[PDB]
Swiss-Prot record, chains A, C:
Lineage: Bacteria, Bacillati, Bacillota, Bacilli, Lactobacillales
Subunit-level organization: Homodimer.
A- repeat residues: 34-44
Localization (cell): Secreted, Cell wall
Compositional bias annotation for Basic and acidic residues: 38-71
Region feature 2 X repeats, type A, mapped onto this chain: 34-71
Residues of the full protein shown: 56 to 126 of 389
Protein's recorded name: M protein, serotype 49
Cited function: This protein is one of the different antigenic serotypes of protein M. Protein M is closely associated with virulence of the bacterium and can render the organism resistant to phagocytosis.
The family this protein is said to belong to: Belongs to the M protein family.
Gene name in the database record: emm49
From Swiss-Prot, chains B, D:
Positions of the Sushi domain: 2-63, 64-125
Role this protein plays: Controls the classical pathway of complement activation. It binds as a cofactor to C3b/C4b inactivator (C3bINA), which then hydrolyzes the complement fragment C4b. It also accelerates the degradation of the C4bC2a complex (C3 convertase) by dissociating the complement fragment C2a. Alpha chain binds C4b. It also interacts with anticoagulant protein S and with serum amyloid P component.
Domain of life of the source: Eukaryota
Section covered of the full-length record: 49 to 172 of 597
Expressing tissues: Chylomicrons in the plasma.
Identification of the protein by name: C4b-binding protein alpha chain
Organism: Homo sapiens (Human)
Localization, UniProt: Secreted
Length: 71, 125, 71, 125
């Protein structure tokens, strides 16, 4: 009795140190995913803003064509 | 209307060294790591510089916690509070017995985590 | 007193709850995130195969053209 | 080489209420949502089909933990096991004292988390 009660007290205190540790490994991971996904968000953005610069240029180059097709 | 040097924290240190420039640009966010003995309570580990010119953040590191020191046979272990970093515990024997070992223990940094500054004493006849 | 040792029961058992629970919400987040990052990698992938296609189509619509400056 | 219909779990149910075709090609992976009473224990919540004609997976939903019910003045709160989903706790009073309430309480689902089937009893005189 004296030795099973103090055993539960060990178990609880053992668990608490562990949960606050898991808790640590976990937002270690969501820290690094939230990071990539901020990087990837910027990369894909950069790509699009480029493929839009270019679509705009080719759109002028076809406007030039259409003209030269009388001149 | 901009940001001065960074305030020292009890739980975190920078990741990219502090040369403590006279000021910082409004909006710059600085990267922090956990001090030994601490773990993270929050996903993001930083602090930025707002439009007023002060650093603004949450408390992203809290205390690590030691495990129980073990069952003191025929003695009792007194947890004033918790086993969280730099918390002290005290041990003590039953009336029959006397203490061989240490009477106090501190939760201290022990290489890659937190352990017990002194081990379990024994309660001898 | 045994009211402050049974307040200790609740005080501990409460940690093991509000920890165990936020353990499974950090997992909830790693889920959402590990998922998202897979849904993105396929979004960007499908945008390269589309880009590779339309390029391969233009490279054709060029050779057809070049083959008309001669024809 | 191929598997069959997904095995009914005791901690999670298949994602879509689908027909369950009696055959699945090797490699097919099913997604699962945690049953009520359980939380996520692993990150990914799935099961895969190997080249052995079997469904292999992890144990990815554990029991939710009930909170302690309050302090029982002039009484004992008896925890055989833990406050995990399903686990029973029993109450009892001191010697002079009589019990005005339920003797026992189950940790069942309340809202979409978990609560106590019966409230704390009274211990009066």
């Amino acid at each position: 009795n004296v030795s099973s009660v103090a055993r539960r007290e060990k178990e609880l205190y053992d668990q608490i140190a562990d949960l606050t540790d898991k808790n640590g490994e976990y937002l270690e991971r969501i820290g690094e995913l939230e990071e990539r996904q901020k990087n990837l968000e910027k990369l894909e953005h950069q790509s699009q803003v480029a493929a839009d610069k270019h679509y705009q240029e080719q759109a002028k180059k076809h406007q030039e064509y259409k003209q030269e097709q009388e001149e | 209307s901009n940001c001065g040097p960074p305030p020292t924290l009890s739980f975190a240190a920078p990741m990219d060294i502090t040369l403590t420039e006279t000021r910082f640009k409004t909006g710059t966010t600085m990267k922090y790591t956990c001090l030994p003995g601490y773990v993270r309570s929050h996903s993001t580990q930083t602090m930025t510089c707002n439009s007023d010119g002060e650093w603004v953040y949450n408390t992203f590191c809290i205390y690590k916690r030691c495990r129980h020191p073990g069952e003191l046979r025929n003695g009792q272990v007194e947890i004033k509070t918790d086993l969280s970093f730099g918390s002290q515990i005290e041990f003590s024997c039953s009336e029959g017995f006397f203490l061989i070992g240490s009477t106090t223990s501190r939760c201290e940094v022990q290489d890659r985590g937190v352990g017990w500054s002194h081990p379990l004493p024994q309660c001898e006849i």
